[PDB]
């Protein structure tokens, strides 16, 4: 409804989403550091799915290097920090799904029950490259405990998967698409790399 599309573009809308991106990052980060409030996190992700999808609607039917798509990448430049945070939240919990399961890791876990200990976990993710120190401190937080050595490695890995089976998908579509209608554009490139 192109006549309607320009109305939202010339509207006090971008300053609303950039604020949303900011608040989405911290609670998504704060909520993960607990096991009882995990239930609220699920419907918080559902809000992310219903927020990014409307950005697709603005972008549908757009011309290459158009004016609507210019503000899409422009709004991210200011709302960057928030975005990046989200993308990270995904990687982190998608690289763990692999680590746990890698021969190496299964060599640190030494116990019948099927649980690793905090110390070990640290050593593992640290012995392996990546996973900068402070991130390791965070991961030994969103984890559970039980004698500080019952971090049942399994669950953790396959916990925040399904809930975000999407979100991560619908940001992949977002970065790719703009990355086709607004071709030559450095700003965006950076995002796609992360």
């Amino acid at each position: 409804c192109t006549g309607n599309q320009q109305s939202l573009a010339h509207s006090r809308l971008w300053d609303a989403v950039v604020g949303f991106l900011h608040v989405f990052a911290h609670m998504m980060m704060k909520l993960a550091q607990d096991s009882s409030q995990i239930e609220l996190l699920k419907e918080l992700l559902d809000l992310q799915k219903d927020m990014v999808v409307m950005l697709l609607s603005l972008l549908e039917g757009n011309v290459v290097n158009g004016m609507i798509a210019r503000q899409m990448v422009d709004m991210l430049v200011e709302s960057s920090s928030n975005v990046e945070m989200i993308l990270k939240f995904f990687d982190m919990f998608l690289k763990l799904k692999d680590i746990v399961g890698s021969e190496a890791f299964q060599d640190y876990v030494t116990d019948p029950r099927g649980l690793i200990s905090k110390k070990d976990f640290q050593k593992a993710m640290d012995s392996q490259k990546q996973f900068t120190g402070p991130e390791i401190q965070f991961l030994l937080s969103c984890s559970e405990a039980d004698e500080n050595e019952m971090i049942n490695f399994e669950e953790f890995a396959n916990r925040f998967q399904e809930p975000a089976r999407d979100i991560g998908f619908n940001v992949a579509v977002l970065l790719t698409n703009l990355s086709e209608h607004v071709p030559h554009d450095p700003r965006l490139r950076n995002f796609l790399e992360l």
């Binding site: 692999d98 680590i99 890698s102 190496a104």
Partner: protein, 49 residues
């Protein structure tokens, strides 16, 4: 791809091949996700690590 699982360990694997370092570019790569002391065998360099 099996008769050739015999040479991997050999101490002259890169014989008629310029890169006499292959065994050290695999330890450096697939050397974290897999025990630095596990790929330190199926590529010879026993203890060479």
């Amino acid at each position: 791809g099996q008769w050739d699982r015999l040479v991997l360990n050999t101490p002259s694997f890169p014989s008629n091949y310029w890169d006499k370092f292959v065994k050290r570019k695999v330890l450096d790569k697939h050397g974290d996700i897999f025990g630095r002391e596990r790929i330190a065998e199926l590529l010879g360099m026993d203890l060479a690590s």
